[PDB]
Amino acid sequence: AALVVDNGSGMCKAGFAGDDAPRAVFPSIVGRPRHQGVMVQKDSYVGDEAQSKRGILTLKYPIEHGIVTNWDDMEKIWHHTFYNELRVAPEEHPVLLTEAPLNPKANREKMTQIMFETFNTPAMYVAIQAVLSLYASGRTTGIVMDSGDGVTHTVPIYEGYALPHAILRLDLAGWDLTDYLMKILTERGYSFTTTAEREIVRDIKEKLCYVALDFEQEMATAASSSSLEKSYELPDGQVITIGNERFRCPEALFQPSFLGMESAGIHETTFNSIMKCDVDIRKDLYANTVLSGGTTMYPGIADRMQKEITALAPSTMKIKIIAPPERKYSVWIGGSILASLSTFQQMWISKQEYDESGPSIVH
Amino acid sequence: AALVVDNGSGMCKAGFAGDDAPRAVFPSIVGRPRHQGVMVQKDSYVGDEAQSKRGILTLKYPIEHGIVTNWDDMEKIWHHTFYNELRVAPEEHPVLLTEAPLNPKANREKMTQIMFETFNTPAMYVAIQAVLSLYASGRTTGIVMDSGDGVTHTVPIYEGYALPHAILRLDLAGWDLTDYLMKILTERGYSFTTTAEREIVRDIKEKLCYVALDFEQEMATAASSSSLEKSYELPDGQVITIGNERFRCPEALFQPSFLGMESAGIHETTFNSIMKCDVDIRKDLYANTVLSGGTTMYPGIADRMQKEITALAPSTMKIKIIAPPERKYSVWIGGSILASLSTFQQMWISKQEYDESGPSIVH
Amino acid sequence: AALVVDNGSGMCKAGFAGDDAPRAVFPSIVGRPRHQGVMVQKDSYVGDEAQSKRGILTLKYPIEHGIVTNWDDMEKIWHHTFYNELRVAPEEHPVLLTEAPLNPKANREKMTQIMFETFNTPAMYVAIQAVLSLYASGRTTGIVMDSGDGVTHTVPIYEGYALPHAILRLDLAGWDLTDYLMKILTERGYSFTTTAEREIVRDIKEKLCYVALDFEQEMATAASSSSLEKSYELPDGQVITIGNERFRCPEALFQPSFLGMESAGIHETTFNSIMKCDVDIRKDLYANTVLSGGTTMYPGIADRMQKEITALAPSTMKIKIIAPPERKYSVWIGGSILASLSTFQQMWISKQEYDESGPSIVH
Amino acid sequence: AALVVDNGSGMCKAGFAGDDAPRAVFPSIVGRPRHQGVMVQKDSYVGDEAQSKRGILTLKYPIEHGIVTNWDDMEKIWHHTFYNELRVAPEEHPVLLTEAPLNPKANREKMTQIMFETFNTPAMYVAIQAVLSLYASGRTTGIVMDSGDGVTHTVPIYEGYALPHAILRLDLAGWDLTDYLMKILTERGYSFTTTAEREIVRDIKEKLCYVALDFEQEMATAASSSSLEKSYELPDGQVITIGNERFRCPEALFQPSFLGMESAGIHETTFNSIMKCDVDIRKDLYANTVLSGGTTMYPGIADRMQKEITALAPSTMKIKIIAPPERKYSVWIGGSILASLSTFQQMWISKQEYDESGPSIVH
Amino acid sequence: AALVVDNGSGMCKAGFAGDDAPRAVFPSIVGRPRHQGVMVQKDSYVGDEAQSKRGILTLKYPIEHGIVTNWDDMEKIWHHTFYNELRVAPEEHPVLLTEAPLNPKANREKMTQIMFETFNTPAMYVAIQAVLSLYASGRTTGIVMDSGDGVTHTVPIYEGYALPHAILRLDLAGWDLTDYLMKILTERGYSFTTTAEREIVRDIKEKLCYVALDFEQEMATAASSSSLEKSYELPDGQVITIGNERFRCPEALFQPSFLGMESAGIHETTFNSIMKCDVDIRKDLYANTVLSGGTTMYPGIADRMQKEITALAPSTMKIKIIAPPERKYSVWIGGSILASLSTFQQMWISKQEYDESGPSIVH
Ligand SMILES: Nc1ncnc2c1ncn2[C@@H]1O[C@H](COP(=O)(O)OP(=O)(O)O)[C@@H](O)[C@H]1O
Ligand SMILES: Nc1ncnc2c1ncn2[C@@H]1O[C@H](COP(=O)(O)OP(=O)(O)O)[C@@H](O)[C@H]1O
Ligand SMILES: Nc1ncnc2c1ncn2[C@@H]1O[C@H](COP(=O)(O)OP(=O)(O)O)[C@@H](O)[C@H]1O
Ligand SMILES: Nc1ncnc2c1ncn2[C@@H]1O[C@H](COP(=O)(O)OP(=O)(O)O)[C@@H](O)[C@H]1O
Ligand SMILES: Nc1ncnc2c1ncn2[C@@H]1O[C@H](COP(=O)(O)OP(=O)(O)O)[C@@H](O)[C@H]1O
Ligand SMILES: [Mg+2]
Ligand SMILES: [Mg+2]
Ligand SMILES: [Mg+2]
Ligand SMILES: [Mg+2]
Ligand SMILES: [Mg+2]
């Protein structure tokens, strides 16, 4: 059985091909102690180990905006994934990895060198994340907008053919929303600064934030009452209350100028990607807009995306946003489907092909 | 039963001799994918298959101006015609094919070699398209002006005898009108460039274009109001509006200088063909001018042809333009009549005659 | 009832003895197609059939200058005459044929062999055409000037006796006038060249040409005004206008030098024929000059003949030109009278006399 | 010195009487621009000027089949001839013009009106072209077959006397052969349609076409090998190859049915012209058959004419075809000889005789 | 003195007629602040002002693909051109403007309305850009391939006459190459996204990119060494290094499939434009292929164009690419020559003609 590892910027999702859900889901973090030990202790902690001891750790993400910036810590996470989470020998199973489009070429080549020389996997393959999300929905036509912690990208596919010239990629994703929520929480006097407190803000974001259907009407509602106020208990028992920050944080996905970015929102990025495609396939892309990733899990984002794209598209087009309830695992689920196909078993890059063609075989 | 295949530049019309209408009518196109497949797909698409997937295809016509330029794609269309459209075994039926006059000799010889060596037809015959159109109208005397996608030709026939020295042929037909409509649509800011968008312009031409009775009076009407403006919805919901382009495009049939051509219009070509005939038969040709082909399906072309030929012919002649409502299928209908005649069953070129006389038997 | 067939160079006039007019009058032509048939058609056309389809035919006269030059086509005309025009069985009726004087001996012998061996007529007789014209006028004394399409001949007869030494024959007739009209029509830019266009010129000649009383005065009248101009509409609606060609064409009958001929005009030929007769019978020939044939049907030819012969004859002679209005059929009418006489029934050449005396019985 | 202008349908040959060759030889064409000028250009081009710029011009011949159809363009060619080519004042020299026999009377009268009222020539004369060709050969007896671009005519002359009744004229000449070569070049896929491309086909005809001695044997030779194939480089570097079209095009001179014409070939036209002459002069005409004009410049036409006339003439006659190597200029050379004769100086039509006798003096 | 304004998609080149170089050359951009001012600042910046402050601006091009999309910003650029750059009163000088062929009709009419109603110019004229480039080279015959930031178009001209039916236009130009360089720079981890960073990529393109003579040989050279690597210092001191991207970016001009476009390269577009012209003028167009515009300023593009057209043209044609070193200003230089011609002073459209004929006078 093949191993499917979906390693975006924020999470590591691993499991076996053929299953319907990842077996191991943990944060893609490496924590190191920032104090002195006095008791007569591991040197570093990975994943949920680092998340539970984060009070005395400095947390580091080895992947930033889809790109591995620390390859030593990236091997710790893969080692922790294989031996501690899945508890398998990686030299016995082919590994299917994922990657965002328009990534540096050296990123995929280093992933290949590590899988073949450090873990000694027999076969290997690197797929595009948005393509796997279309496998998960059981479609061959559609435009996938995948947004995780580091990357947001749109990939249009028609009848199984990708339109690579129409692929768009934004560096605006979940990390920027957490960073923005930290900034607007200072307006109420809540100061979060350390890497451990950044994990608390992300937990606040995932539990209290939502997408407003009309932002200006929602701002006027929050300024005239308190029906939108929600409380949240910090780990030390302190209770914070947030109001319009609940929908102002996800609003940066549609108005990136809140972050000082010049780019377009996720609705205009999806529309611009459709408009780069041929006129004859746009009608099918409008009706098969698929959301994927953890950053699409805000309540009300599918209704907001449909409203915003309807205002950009011609009035005779049928805008249909497909947001399955399991779309946080769509990349992994689609990778599990792909690695189980019989027509895919010739797509593997074996270790022999890597020894005779070098790392350039992965491109 | 014999097979009747009318394969002009634009369309493929196929059926069985004795029927009153073709059973298979599809565009004579071969589409190949111009992108990369990412889903784990045929290598080429023919006819209506290529027309529905044209968003991701490069469309190619194997016949250009009546002459087959790609014999590999021409066999794909004939193979698609026999096995997918008609669903017959071509080695059991004689095949009646059509061809424009004044074509290269090697074009008809290659059609004969393919029908006998690739499809193994028992018998075969290649007829002239304008002659078949006269069978469809139930006449033995008349001048047929047939205009399709690639070729416009006039063939005068008197009492069953053809006047080959009076046959005229123009390379101005439906393809040049579509190409001209694409050019004058840029005046309103509508840009069509790809082969898929050329199919959209042809659809615009067939639905909105018409022949003006007086061109200069029609130009003054369109410049003073908007009663001639029509809208058209593109496949992606965008709506374009055209005014004088509706009659300026078909006007190139009567004024080929709009295309930069030096040749004469279809009215002067018909008149020059009559004037090459003997003086004693011109009166019968004037009264039996038969229109045929898809390019004669513009509204108002019969009234315009009659007006233009009346101005060229002597005032005592009776100009009568015969434009039947089914004249888009006249070549096929006439071929179905001819292949069903008992006096035609000796005109077939059997495979034995082809083996003993070579490909020169077809001439 | 006997059959009377008057077959000159141009026309075939057939009917039954006793009638006052021929029942069948058609051009003595055989037309064959000069193009290729494409419609899935007789091999040749005779008479009015060839005249109506002459646009696609090559027209041939089997009789040239009174002499049959094509005996295969001559049988087609006789076959068409008996079975299609008269609709009789020629093996039941005696046939009276006509011939110009001073013809080759083999011409009359071949007519006899065909009538007895091909059509199996019971009896047969060949008469001289000018002698029959004198029967038609009810005279026994007179000089007959018969002019058709091929031959002009004068035969003087006195009290029922022919003067064979005074018979004159000219090869100047209607064919040469049509040929001359074609030549002088080029002066106005009218080009007639084909055998079908020669039939049009002959129609122009029969409708617009006339004999001028004084040629030089008529030439001066046409050169000073336009009262002599007449229009004529061609079969294709084109209108031609002719002036002095109307009387210049028939003037060749009186001045054969217009045709490059050295012979004398029809007036001097008639006078020379009278002067070869005995002095005692010339006075009766001067008073009984009978015109006959289609070439004598020009308006004003009787007044011109009288004026020209009066200038040649002594001033005390009474010149009387007899030009009956039915003189185009005089040979046939006279043959119908002769074949009905009871004293003629012993002049027939029966088939028994032909079998025992050979073809020399006809001379 | 008198000016000699030989202006047939295709070429204009001009010079001075007494010289042995024309000084100016250029195509009788007038070209007008068929596009729009954008550079900040003459309105029309004549002769070699139009031939070099023919890519952007519509070429028109003012003379068609020996008859001037455009008198405005005919004056442009004469004006270009006098002032640009010969560089003389036409009001100082008498002009000798040429004309085909059996031309419309108004054609010669308009040439006289233009020479006297537009160019103000002192004297003028219009000669028959075939008569001048006999001066060029130094003969007083012979039949001249002159064939140019528009007209083919035969004029028999005996001891200095013309036989006008034996003059024959065909409208089959070089223009019809070029038009026929264009038609049979489509059999190999070579499409020439514009007036500029017609000049290219004429160049192909003059360089590659020849007359086959036996046509059926030559057709069998070309169908069994490739020794008759010749290549020709088009102006744009494209190379075309022609085989049996090299001798099929000139074969229309001997079999006009290839053009759909009913007329006889040039061999039968020459023979029919001799047979219209008196029996006593035919022997001298058989031995002095003179070829003239550009259409007689095909290799092998003299040997073919001799073979074809020998088969028509009695076996005891000596058929001698005189084809001088300079017979393309025979009409001009003979006109230069005639205009230099002292016994011709009274044949000029002075401007005084034209003012007192009108335009009818030229006939 | 007349004003010459060459305003393509990317640059604005302005000056006075008669000069040899534009006086004002600045980017055709309008920048607006995308932040909040806190210092107690113009509302928008044009040209070099916007280019120097682009760090805090959003840069907008009012002309996209040759078509003005923002007429308010287009007036800001013209106002900045007249009053700030040239420092003249536009109501005193006639203005010569430029435009790409096959542009929307309303684009030229709005330019005319603004020049006459907003700037009150006395006279005005709009020329075609490729025609002006032929004035700059001192030629009247040649095919001009002009490529700027928005449009690539070929205009063949022969002897001063344009062939409008042979004009081709591509929407592939400098903007698409900059956009493509941004995409392939992500392969090395260089992320440029904002409109200010797009100006940096364009600067990289103009300094480091070149056209490879053989693309596949150049790709193999770059993959085997580092002799093609060049460094570039960003505005903030960061140094980027690019290898095969130097010639892969300009290669999209010859292989537009790199951009996902179906169209043909600039070499095949030039060849197809020549092949639409008459056969007689193609030889002169092959020898006078003129390059123009900023997108033709890549090193090695003239040698590559000659190599690619030589492979398409017949081997006997002489392909000569004329690439003057000042061809970035050819449109302006040619407009300066045209506006100084005395024969052009009647081509101006005065303000009186605009008031009496409306905006339709410009077409
Ligand atoms: N219920 C939720 N609501 C909003 N955001 C969420 C939710 N769950 C996860 N996220 C965000 O999704 C991001 C990561 O999503 P995911 O696609 O699973 O990870 P990866 O970046 O590895 O692809 C994180 O930044 C996280 O804050
Ligand atoms: N209703 C219509 N009006 C105008 N043009 C038409 C119409 N229908 C078809 N055509 C044109 O006719 C051309 C082909 O006609 P047809 O004779 O059926 O094909 P073929 O070229 O195979 O003979 C096409 O170019 C098409 O644009
Ligand atoms: N009305 C007419 N006027 C002048 N010529 C005529 C007229 N009718 C007939 N002809 C001429 O008479 C010729 C034949 O006359 P006819 O004697 O009837 O024929 P055939 O030659 O058979 O004896 C034809 O050449 C025809 O042109
Ligand atoms: N060498 C040649 N071979 C065959 N045909 C020729 C040759 N030279 C000229 N011709 C033809 O002769 C025709 C004109 O001949 P010419 O008698 O010189 O002109 P015109 O028609 O003015 O009398 C043209 O149609 C041309 O094609
Ligand atoms: N040296 C150079 N090398 C390559 N490209 C250049 C160079 N200089 C300018 N360009 C490109 O030319 C384009 C504009 O050229 P130009 O014709 O001057 O402008 P316009 O679009 O106004 O006609 C820009 O996209 C620019 O990137
Ligand atoms: Mg994800
Ligand atoms: Mg058709
Ligand atoms: Mg008669
Ligand atoms: Mg000549
Ligand atoms: Mg430019």
Author numbering:
A (entry chain A), B (entry chain C), C (entry chain E), D (entry chain D), E (entry chain B): 6 to 45, 49 to 371
What sentences appear in the manuscript?
The release of inorganic phosphate (Pi) from actin filaments constitutes a key step in their regulated turnover, which is fundamental to many cellular functions. Here, using human and bovine actin isoforms, we combine cryo-EM with molecular-dynamics simulations and in vitro reconstitution to demonstrate how actin releases Pi through a ‘molecular backdoor’. By combining cryo-EM with in vitro reconstitution and MD simulations, we have elucidated how Pi is released from F-actin and that the hydrogen bonding network between the Pro-rich loop, sensor loop, and R177 strand forms the predominant backdoor.
For the second pathway, we aimed to destabilize the putative R183-mediated backdoor using p.R183W and p.R183G mutations. Actin-R183G and actin-R183W released Pi at slightly increased rates of, respectively, 0.0117 s−1 and 0.0190 s−1, corresponding to a 1.8- and 2.9-fold increase compared with wild-type β-actin. In wild-type F-actin structures, the R183 side chain interacts with D157 and the carboxyl moieties of S14 and I71. As expected for F-actin-R183W, these interactions are abolished and the W183 side chain points away from the mentioned residues. Nevertheless, the S14-G74 hydrogen bond remains intact in the mutant, and we did not observe an open cavity near W183 through which Pi could escape; the R177-N111 backdoor is also intact. Although R183 does not directly interact with ADP in wild-type F-actin, it resides in close proximity to the nucleotide and, importantly, it is positioned in a negatively charged cluster of acidic residues. Although we cannot exclude the possibility that this release path is marginally sampled, we propose that, alternatively, Pi still mainly exits through the R177-N111 backdoor in the R183 mutants.
